[PDB]
Amino acid sequence: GSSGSSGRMVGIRKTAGEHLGVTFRVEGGELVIARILHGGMVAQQGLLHVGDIIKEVNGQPVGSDPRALQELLRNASGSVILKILSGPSSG
């Protein structure tokens, strides 16, 4: 009925070490999934897709460091949350 949630909390069933397989880019000041590799987590899920904008993760700032983010997940075992948001991403 009454929707009370911002962005979009995406739940991942990844395991310690398990990598995602994606590339984020910094344009304008936001982390956007530059590209997504097939045969992986994101791909399979089908949820995330090029253009996805990340703001916060499990209550932590992703910052403008995409190379550091892809590493944060690598060490994220259990139900991980990702707050995504839309934008100018053409499509």
PDB file of N, CA and C in Angstrom:
ATOM      1  N   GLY A   1       0.806  -1.207   0.000  1.00  0.00           N
ATOM      2  CA  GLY A   1       0.000   0.000   0.000  1.00  0.00           C
ATOM      3  C   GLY A   1       0.842   1.260   0.000  1.00  0.00           C
ATOM      4  N   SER A   2       1.301   1.664   1.180  1.00  0.00           N
ATOM      5  CA  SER A   2       2.118   2.865   1.314  1.00  0.00           C
ATOM      6  C   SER A   2       3.600   2.532   1.172  1.00  0.00           C
ATOM      7  N   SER A   3       4.184   2.932   0.047  1.00  0.00           N
ATOM      8  CA  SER A   3       5.596   2.673  -0.214  1.00  0.00           C
ATOM      9  C   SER A   3       6.477   3.682   0.516  1.00  0.00           C
ATOM     10  N   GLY A   4       7.294   3.186   1.440  1.00  0.00           N
ATOM     11  CA  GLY A   4       8.177   4.057   2.196  1.00  0.00           C
ATOM     12  C   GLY A   4       9.625   3.614   2.128  1.00  0.00           C
ATOM     13  N   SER A   5      10.232   3.760   0.955  1.00  0.00           N
ATOM     14  CA  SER A   5      11.624   3.367   0.760  1.00  0.00           C
ATOM     15  C   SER A   5      12.257   4.159  -0.380  1.00  0.00           C
ATOM     16  N   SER A   6      13.503   4.576  -0.180  1.00  0.00           N
ATOM     17  CA  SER A   6      14.222   5.346  -1.189  1.00  0.00           C
ATOM     18  C   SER A   6      15.152   4.447  -1.998  1.00  0.00           C
ATOM     19  N   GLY A   7      15.621   4.959  -3.132  1.00  0.00           N
ATOM     20  CA  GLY A   7      16.512   4.190  -3.981  1.00  0.00           C
ATOM     21  C   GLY A   7      15.997   2.790  -4.246  1.00  0.00           C
ATOM     22  N   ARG A   8      16.814   1.790  -3.929  1.00  0.00           N
ATOM     23  CA  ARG A   8      16.435   0.399  -4.138  1.00  0.00           C
ATOM     24  C   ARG A   8      17.440  -0.543  -3.480  1.00  0.00           C
ATOM     25  N   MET A   9      17.037  -1.143  -2.365  1.00  0.00           N
ATOM     26  CA  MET A   9      17.902  -2.066  -1.639  1.00  0.00           C
ATOM     27  C   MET A   9      17.956  -3.422  -2.337  1.00  0.00           C
ATOM     28  N   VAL A  10      19.101  -3.727  -2.939  1.00  0.00           N
ATOM     29  CA  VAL A  10      19.282  -4.993  -3.641  1.00  0.00           C
ATOM     30  C   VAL A  10      19.995  -6.013  -2.759  1.00  0.00           C
ATOM     31  N   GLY A  11      19.351  -7.157  -2.548  1.00  0.00           N
ATOM     32  CA  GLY A  11      19.938  -8.198  -1.724  1.00  0.00           C
ATOM     33  C   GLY A  11      20.747  -9.190  -2.534  1.00  0.00           C
ATOM     34  N   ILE A  12      21.996  -9.400  -2.134  1.00  0.00           N
ATOM     35  CA  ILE A  12      22.876 -10.331  -2.830  1.00  0.00           C
ATOM     36  C   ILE A  12      23.223 -11.524  -1.947  1.00  0.00           C
ATOM     37  N   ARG A  13      23.242 -12.710  -2.546  1.00  0.00           N
ATOM     38  CA  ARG A  13      23.560 -13.931  -1.814  1.00  0.00           C
ATOM     39  C   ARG A  13      24.993 -14.374  -2.092  1.00  0.00           C
ATOM     40  N   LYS A  14      25.909 -13.411  -2.119  1.00  0.00           N
ATOM     41  CA  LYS A  14      27.316 -13.700  -2.373  1.00  0.00           C
ATOM     42  C   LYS A  14      27.974 -14.322  -1.146  1.00  0.00           C
ATOM     43  N   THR A  15      29.153 -14.906  -1.343  1.00  0.00           N
ATOM     44  CA  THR A  15      29.884 -15.538  -0.253  1.00  0.00           C
ATOM     45  C   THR A  15      31.299 -14.978  -0.143  1.00  0.00           C
ATOM     46  N   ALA A  16      31.834 -14.970   1.072  1.00  0.00           N
ATOM     47  CA  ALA A  16      33.180 -14.464   1.311  1.00  0.00           C
ATOM     48  C   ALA A  16      34.087 -14.727   0.114  1.00  0.00           C
ATOM     49  N   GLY A  17      34.820 -13.701  -0.304  1.00  0.00           N
ATOM     50  CA  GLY A  17      35.717 -13.843  -1.437  1.00  0.00           C
ATOM     51  C   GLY A  17      34.996 -13.725  -2.765  1.00  0.00           C
ATOM     52  N   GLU A  18      33.887 -14.447  -2.900  1.00  0.00           N
ATOM     53  CA  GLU A  18      33.107 -14.422  -4.131  1.00  0.00           C
ATOM     54  C   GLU A  18      33.081 -13.019  -4.732  1.00  0.00           C
ATOM     55  N   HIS A  19      33.493 -12.913  -5.991  1.00  0.00           N
ATOM     56  CA  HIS A  19      33.519 -11.629  -6.682  1.00  0.00           C
ATOM     57  C   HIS A  19      32.242 -11.421  -7.491  1.00  0.00           C
ATOM     58  N   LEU A  20      31.950 -10.167  -7.817  1.00  0.00           N
ATOM     59  CA  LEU A  20      30.758  -9.833  -8.588  1.00  0.00           C
ATOM     60  C   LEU A  20      31.039  -9.908 -10.085  1.00  0.00           C
ATOM     61  N   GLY A  21      32.000  -9.111 -10.542  1.00  0.00           N
ATOM     62  CA  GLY A  21      32.350  -9.104 -11.951  1.00  0.00           C
ATOM     63  C   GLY A  21      31.732  -7.937 -12.696  1.00  0.00           C
ATOM     64  N   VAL A  22      32.008  -6.724 -12.227  1.00  0.00           N
ATOM     65  CA  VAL A  22      31.474  -5.522 -12.855  1.00  0.00           C
ATOM     66  C   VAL A  22      32.480  -4.378 -12.798  1.00  0.00           C
ATOM     67  N   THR A  23      32.264  -3.365 -13.632  1.00  0.00           N
ATOM     68  CA  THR A  23      33.152  -2.210 -13.677  1.00  0.00           C
ATOM     69  C   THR A  23      32.378  -0.913 -13.473  1.00  0.00           C
ATOM     70  N   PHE A  24      32.735  -0.174 -12.428  1.00  0.00           N
ATOM     71  CA  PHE A  24      32.073   1.088 -12.123  1.00  0.00           C
ATOM     72  C   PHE A  24      32.892   2.270 -12.635  1.00  0.00           C
ATOM     73  N   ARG A  25      32.202   3.341 -13.015  1.00  0.00           N
ATOM     74  CA  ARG A  25      32.864   4.535 -13.524  1.00  0.00           C
ATOM     75  C   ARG A  25      32.431   5.773 -12.743  1.00  0.00           C
ATOM     76  N   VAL A  26      33.308   6.771 -12.692  1.00  0.00           N
ATOM     77  CA  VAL A  26      33.016   8.009 -11.979  1.00  0.00           C
ATOM     78  C   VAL A  26      32.791   9.162 -12.949  1.00  0.00           C
ATOM     79  N   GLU A  27      31.528   9.525 -13.146  1.00  0.00           N
ATOM     80  CA  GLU A  27      31.179  10.614 -14.050  1.00  0.00           C
ATOM     81  C   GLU A  27      30.199  11.578 -13.388  1.00  0.00           C
ATOM     82  N   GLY A  28      30.631  12.824 -13.212  1.00  0.00           N
ATOM     83  CA  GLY A  28      29.780  13.823 -12.591  1.00  0.00           C
ATOM     84  C   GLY A  28      29.890  13.819 -11.080  1.00  0.00           C
ATOM     85  N   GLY A  29      30.272  12.675 -10.519  1.00  0.00           N
ATOM     86  CA  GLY A  29      30.406  12.564  -9.078  1.00  0.00           C
ATOM     87  C   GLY A  29      29.566  11.442  -8.502  1.00  0.00           C
ATOM     88  N   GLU A  30      29.317  10.416  -9.310  1.00  0.00           N
ATOM     89  CA  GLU A  30      28.519   9.277  -8.873  1.00  0.00           C
ATOM     90  C   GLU A  30      29.052   7.977  -9.471  1.00  0.00           C
ATOM     91  N   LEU A  31      28.902   6.886  -8.729  1.00  0.00           N
ATOM     92  CA  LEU A  31      29.367   5.581  -9.184  1.00  0.00           C
ATOM     93  C   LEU A  31      28.320   4.907 -10.065  1.00  0.00           C
ATOM     94  N   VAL A  32      28.651   4.733 -11.341  1.00  0.00           N
ATOM     95  CA  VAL A  32      27.742   4.098 -12.287  1.00  0.00           C
ATOM     96  C   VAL A  32      28.360   2.838 -12.883  1.00  0.00           C
ATOM     97  N   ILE A  33      27.592   1.753 -12.884  1.00  0.00           N
ATOM     98  CA  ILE A  33      28.064   0.485 -13.426  1.00  0.00           C
ATOM     99  C   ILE A  33      28.453   0.625 -14.894  1.00  0.00           C
ATOM    100  N   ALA A  34      29.725   0.919 -15.138  1.00  0.00           N
ATOM    101  CA  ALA A  34      30.225   1.077 -16.498  1.00  0.00           C
ATOM    102  C   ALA A  34      29.846  -0.119 -17.365  1.00  0.00           C
ATOM    103  N   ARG A  35      30.207  -1.313 -16.908  1.00  0.00           N
ATOM    104  CA  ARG A  35      29.906  -2.536 -17.643  1.00  0.00           C
ATOM    105  C   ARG A  35      29.699  -3.707 -16.687  1.00  0.00           C
ATOM    106  N   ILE A  36      29.035  -4.751 -17.175  1.00  0.00           N
ATOM    107  CA  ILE A  36      28.771  -5.934 -16.365  1.00  0.00           C
ATOM    108  C   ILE A  36      29.169  -7.206 -17.105  1.00  0.00           C
ATOM    109  N   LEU A  37      30.014  -8.012 -16.473  1.00  0.00           N
ATOM    110  CA  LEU A  37      30.471  -9.263 -17.070  1.00  0.00           C
ATOM    111  C   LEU A  37      29.401 -10.344 -16.954  1.00  0.00           C
ATOM    112  N   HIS A  38      29.342 -11.220 -17.953  1.00  0.00           N
ATOM    113  CA  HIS A  38      28.367 -12.304 -17.961  1.00  0.00           C
ATOM    114  C   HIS A  38      28.841 -13.469 -17.096  1.00  0.00           C
ATOM    115  N   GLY A  39      27.955 -14.436 -16.877  1.00  0.00           N
ATOM    116  CA  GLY A  39      28.301 -15.589 -16.067  1.00  0.00           C
ATOM    117  C   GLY A  39      28.767 -15.203 -14.677  1.00  0.00           C
ATOM    118  N   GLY A  40      28.074 -14.245 -14.067  1.00  0.00           N
ATOM    119  CA  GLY A  40      28.439 -13.800 -12.735  1.00  0.00           C
ATOM    120  C   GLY A  40      27.230 -13.581 -11.846  1.00  0.00           C
ATOM    121  N   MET A  41      27.411 -12.796 -10.788  1.00  0.00           N
ATOM    122  CA  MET A  41      26.325 -12.509  -9.857  1.00  0.00           C
ATOM    123  C   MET A  41      25.331 -11.526 -10.467  1.00  0.00           C
ATOM    124  N   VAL A  42      25.782 -10.295 -10.688  1.00  0.00           N
ATOM    125  CA  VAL A  42      24.932  -9.262 -11.267  1.00  0.00           C
ATOM    126  C   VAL A  42      24.206  -9.779 -12.505  1.00  0.00           C
ATOM    127  N   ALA A  43      24.977 -10.213 -13.498  1.00  0.00           N
ATOM    128  CA  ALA A  43      24.408 -10.734 -14.734  1.00  0.00           C
ATOM    129  C   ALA A  43      23.231 -11.662 -14.449  1.00  0.00           C
ATOM    130  N   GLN A  44      23.519 -12.803 -13.831  1.00  0.00           N
ATOM    131  CA  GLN A  44      22.485 -13.776 -13.504  1.00  0.00           C
ATOM    132  C   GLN A  44      21.258 -13.088 -12.912  1.00  0.00           C
ATOM    133  N   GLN A  45      21.453 -12.409 -11.787  1.00  0.00           N
ATOM    134  CA  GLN A  45      20.363 -11.708 -11.119  1.00  0.00           C
ATOM    135  C   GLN A  45      19.510 -10.944 -12.127  1.00  0.00           C
ATOM    136  N   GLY A  46      20.171 -10.245 -13.045  1.00  0.00           N
ATOM    137  CA  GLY A  46      19.457  -9.481 -14.052  1.00  0.00           C
ATOM    138  C   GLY A  46      18.929  -8.165 -13.513  1.00  0.00           C
ATOM    139  N   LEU A  47      19.030  -7.981 -12.202  1.00  0.00           N
ATOM    140  CA  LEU A  47      18.556  -6.759 -11.563  1.00  0.00           C
ATOM    141  C   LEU A  47      19.389  -5.557 -12.001  1.00  0.00           C
ATOM    142  N   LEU A  48      20.621  -5.488 -11.511  1.00  0.00           N
ATOM    143  CA  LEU A  48      21.520  -4.392 -11.853  1.00  0.00           C
ATOM    144  C   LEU A  48      21.808  -4.371 -13.351  1.00  0.00           C
ATOM    145  N   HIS A  49      21.979  -3.172 -13.899  1.00  0.00           N
ATOM    146  CA  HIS A  49      22.263  -3.015 -15.321  1.00  0.00           C
ATOM    147  C   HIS A  49      22.954  -1.682 -15.593  1.00  0.00           C
ATOM    148  N   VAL A  50      23.776  -1.650 -16.637  1.00  0.00           N
ATOM    149  CA  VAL A  50      24.498  -0.437 -17.005  1.00  0.00           C
ATOM    150  C   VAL A  50      23.659   0.806 -16.730  1.00  0.00           C
ATOM    151  N   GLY A  51      24.246   1.765 -16.021  1.00  0.00           N
ATOM    152  CA  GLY A  51      23.538   2.992 -15.702  1.00  0.00           C
ATOM    153  C   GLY A  51      23.172   3.085 -14.234  1.00  0.00           C
ATOM    154  N   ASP A  52      23.138   1.941 -13.561  1.00  0.00           N
ATOM    155  CA  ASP A  52      22.799   1.897 -12.143  1.00  0.00           C
ATOM    156  C   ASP A  52      23.716   2.811 -11.336  1.00  0.00           C
ATOM    157  N   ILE A  53      23.118   3.651 -10.498  1.00  0.00           N
ATOM    158  CA  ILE A  53      23.882   4.576  -9.670  1.00  0.00           C
ATOM    159  C   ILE A  53      23.865   4.147  -8.207  1.00  0.00           C
ATOM    160  N   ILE A  54      25.051   3.970  -7.635  1.00  0.00           N
ATOM    161  CA  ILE A  54      25.173   3.564  -6.240  1.00  0.00           C
ATOM    162  C   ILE A  54      25.415   4.767  -5.336  1.00  0.00           C
ATOM    163  N   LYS A  55      24.749   4.779  -4.186  1.00  0.00           N
ATOM    164  CA  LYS A  55      24.893   5.871  -3.230  1.00  0.00           C
ATOM    165  C   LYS A  55      25.512   5.374  -1.927  1.00  0.00           C
ATOM    166  N   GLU A  56      24.858   4.401  -1.300  1.00  0.00           N
ATOM    167  CA  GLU A  56      25.346   3.839  -0.046  1.00  0.00           C
ATOM    168  C   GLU A  56      25.241   2.317  -0.055  1.00  0.00           C
ATOM    169  N   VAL A  57      26.087   1.666   0.739  1.00  0.00           N
ATOM    170  CA  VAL A  57      26.089   0.211   0.823  1.00  0.00           C
ATOM    171  C   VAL A  57      26.145  -0.255   2.274  1.00  0.00           C
ATOM    172  N   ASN A  58      25.146  -1.030   2.680  1.00  0.00           N
ATOM    173  CA  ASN A  58      25.081  -1.543   4.044  1.00  0.00           C
ATOM    174  C   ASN A  58      25.318  -0.426   5.056  1.00  0.00           C
ATOM    175  N   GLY A  59      25.023   0.805   4.651  1.00  0.00           N
ATOM    176  CA  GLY A  59      25.209   1.942   5.535  1.00  0.00           C
ATOM    177  C   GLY A  59      26.629   2.470   5.507  1.00  0.00           C
ATOM    178  N   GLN A  60      27.254   2.425   4.334  1.00  0.00           N
ATOM    179  CA  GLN A  60      28.623   2.901   4.179  1.00  0.00           C
ATOM    180  C   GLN A  60      28.795   3.642   2.857  1.00  0.00           C
ATOM    181  N   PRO A  61      29.523   4.767   2.900  1.00  0.00           N
ATOM    182  CA  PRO A  61      29.779   5.590   1.714  1.00  0.00           C
ATOM    183  C   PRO A  61      30.715   4.905   0.723  1.00  0.00           C
ATOM    184  N   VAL A  62      30.272   4.797  -0.525  1.00  0.00           N
ATOM    185  CA  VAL A  62      31.071   4.165  -1.568  1.00  0.00           C
ATOM    186  C   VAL A  62      32.140   5.116  -2.094  1.00  0.00           C
ATOM    187  N   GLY A  63      31.944   6.409  -1.853  1.00  0.00           N
ATOM    188  CA  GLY A  63      32.900   7.401  -2.310  1.00  0.00           C
ATOM    189  C   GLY A  63      33.071   7.392  -3.816  1.00  0.00           C
ATOM    190  N   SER A  64      33.958   8.246  -4.314  1.00  0.00           N
ATOM    191  CA  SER A  64      34.211   8.337  -5.747  1.00  0.00           C
ATOM    192  C   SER A  64      35.285   7.342  -6.175  1.00  0.00           C
ATOM    193  N   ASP A  65      35.550   6.363  -5.317  1.00  0.00           N
ATOM    194  CA  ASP A  65      36.554   5.345  -5.605  1.00  0.00           C
ATOM    195  C   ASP A  65      35.895   4.030  -6.009  1.00  0.00           C
ATOM    196  N   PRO A  66      35.739   3.827  -7.326  1.00  0.00           N
ATOM    197  CA  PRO A  66      35.122   2.614  -7.872  1.00  0.00           C
ATOM    198  C   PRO A  66      36.004   1.383  -7.687  1.00  0.00           C
ATOM    199  N   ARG A  67      37.315   1.583  -7.766  1.00  0.00           N
ATOM    200  CA  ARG A  67      38.266   0.489  -7.609  1.00  0.00           C
ATOM    201  C   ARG A  67      38.275  -0.020  -6.170  1.00  0.00           C
ATOM    202  N   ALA A  68      37.873   0.841  -5.241  1.00  0.00           N
ATOM    203  CA  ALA A  68      37.834   0.478  -3.829  1.00  0.00           C
ATOM    204  C   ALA A  68      36.515  -0.197  -3.472  1.00  0.00           C
ATOM    205  N   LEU A  69      35.462   0.148  -4.205  1.00  0.00           N
ATOM    206  CA  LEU A  69      34.142  -0.425  -3.964  1.00  0.00           C
ATOM    207  C   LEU A  69      34.113  -1.902  -4.343  1.00  0.00           C
ATOM    208  N   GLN A  70      34.494  -2.198  -5.582  1.00  0.00           N
ATOM    209  CA  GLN A  70      34.512  -3.573  -6.067  1.00  0.00           C
ATOM    210  C   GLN A  70      35.256  -4.483  -5.095  1.00  0.00           C
ATOM    211  N   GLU A  71      36.081  -3.883  -4.243  1.00  0.00           N
ATOM    212  CA  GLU A  71      36.851  -4.642  -3.264  1.00  0.00           C
ATOM    213  C   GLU A  71      36.058  -4.827  -1.974  1.00  0.00           C
ATOM    214  N   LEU A  72      35.238  -3.836  -1.643  1.00  0.00           N
ATOM    215  CA  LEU A  72      34.424  -3.889  -0.434  1.00  0.00           C
ATOM    216  C   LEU A  72      33.483  -5.089  -0.462  1.00  0.00           C
ATOM    217  N   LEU A  73      32.891  -5.342  -1.624  1.00  0.00           N
ATOM    218  CA  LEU A  73      31.970  -6.463  -1.785  1.00  0.00           C
ATOM    219  C   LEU A  73      32.705  -7.795  -1.654  1.00  0.00           C
ATOM    220  N   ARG A  74      33.863  -7.891  -2.299  1.00  0.00           N
ATOM    221  CA  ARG A  74      34.663  -9.109  -2.254  1.00  0.00           C
ATOM    222  C   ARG A  74      34.743  -9.654  -0.831  1.00  0.00           C
ATOM    223  N   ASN A  75      34.735  -8.750   0.145  1.00  0.00           N
ATOM    224  CA  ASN A  75      34.810  -9.140   1.547  1.00  0.00           C
ATOM    225  C   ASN A  75      33.473  -8.911   2.247  1.00  0.00           C
ATOM    226  N   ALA A  76      32.386  -9.226   1.550  1.00  0.00           N
ATOM    227  CA  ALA A  76      31.048  -9.058   2.104  1.00  0.00           C
ATOM    228  C   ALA A  76      30.260 -10.361   2.043  1.00  0.00           C
ATOM    229  N   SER A  77      30.329 -11.141   3.117  1.00  0.00           N
ATOM    230  CA  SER A  77      29.626 -12.417   3.182  1.00  0.00           C
ATOM    231  C   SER A  77      28.258 -12.249   3.835  1.00  0.00           C
ATOM    232  N   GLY A  78      27.245 -12.879   3.245  1.00  0.00           N
ATOM    233  CA  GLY A  78      25.900 -12.788   3.781  1.00  0.00           C
ATOM    234  C   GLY A  78      24.995 -11.920   2.930  1.00  0.00           C
ATOM    235  N   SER A  79      23.837 -11.561   3.477  1.00  0.00           N
ATOM    236  CA  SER A  79      22.877 -10.732   2.758  1.00  0.00           C
ATOM    237  C   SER A  79      23.371  -9.292   2.659  1.00  0.00           C
ATOM    238  N   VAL A  80      23.924  -8.941   1.503  1.00  0.00           N
ATOM    239  CA  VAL A  80      24.434  -7.594   1.277  1.00  0.00           C
ATOM    240  C   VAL A  80      23.366  -6.697   0.661  1.00  0.00           C
ATOM    241  N   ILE A  81      23.359  -5.432   1.068  1.00  0.00           N
ATOM    242  CA  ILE A  81      22.389  -4.472   0.555  1.00  0.00           C
ATOM    243  C   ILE A  81      23.071  -3.390  -0.275  1.00  0.00           C
ATOM    244  N   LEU A  82      22.403  -2.957  -1.338  1.00  0.00           N
ATOM    245  CA  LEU A  82      22.945  -1.924  -2.214  1.00  0.00           C
ATOM    246  C   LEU A  82      21.863  -0.924  -2.609  1.00  0.00           C
ATOM    247  N   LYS A  83      22.044   0.328  -2.202  1.00  0.00           N
ATOM    248  CA  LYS A  83      21.087   1.381  -2.516  1.00  0.00           C
ATOM    249  C   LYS A  83      21.384   1.997  -3.881  1.00  0.00           C
ATOM    250  N   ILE A  84      20.605   1.605  -4.884  1.00  0.00           N
ATOM    251  CA  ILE A  84      20.783   2.121  -6.235  1.00  0.00           C
ATOM    252  C   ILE A  84      19.769   3.217  -6.543  1.00  0.00           C
ATOM    253  N   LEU A  85      20.105   4.074  -7.501  1.00  0.00           N
ATOM    254  CA  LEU A  85      19.223   5.168  -7.893  1.00  0.00           C
ATOM    255  C   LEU A  85      19.332   5.444  -9.389  1.00  0.00           C
ATOM    256  N   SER A  86      18.284   6.037  -9.953  1.00  0.00           N
ATOM    257  CA  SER A  86      18.261   6.355 -11.376  1.00  0.00           C
ATOM    258  C   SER A  86      19.041   7.635 -11.660  1.00  0.00           C
ATOM    259  N   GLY A  87      19.006   8.077 -12.913  1.00  0.00           N
ATOM    260  CA  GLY A  87      19.714   9.286 -13.293  1.00  0.00           C
ATOM    261  C   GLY A  87      19.581   9.594 -14.771  1.00  0.00           C
ATOM    262  N   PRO A  88      20.526  10.386 -15.302  1.00  0.00           N
ATOM    263  CA  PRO A  88      20.531  10.773 -16.716  1.00  0.00           C
ATOM    264  C   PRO A  88      20.857   9.602 -17.636  1.00  0.00           C
ATOM    265  N   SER A  89      21.363   8.520 -17.054  1.00  0.00           N
ATOM    266  CA  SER A  89      21.719   7.334 -17.824  1.00  0.00           C
ATOM    267  C   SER A  89      20.703   7.080 -18.933  1.00  0.00           C
ATOM    268  N   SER A  90      21.087   7.402 -20.163  1.00  0.00           N
ATOM    269  CA  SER A  90      20.209   7.213 -21.312  1.00  0.00           C
ATOM    270  C   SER A  90      19.778   5.754 -21.433  1.00  0.00           C
ATOM    271  N   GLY A  91      18.544   5.543 -21.881  1.00  0.00           N
ATOM    272  CA  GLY A  91      18.032   4.194 -22.033  1.00  0.00           C
ATOM    273  C   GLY A  91      16.519   4.155 -22.122  1.00  0.00           C
TER     274      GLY A  91
END
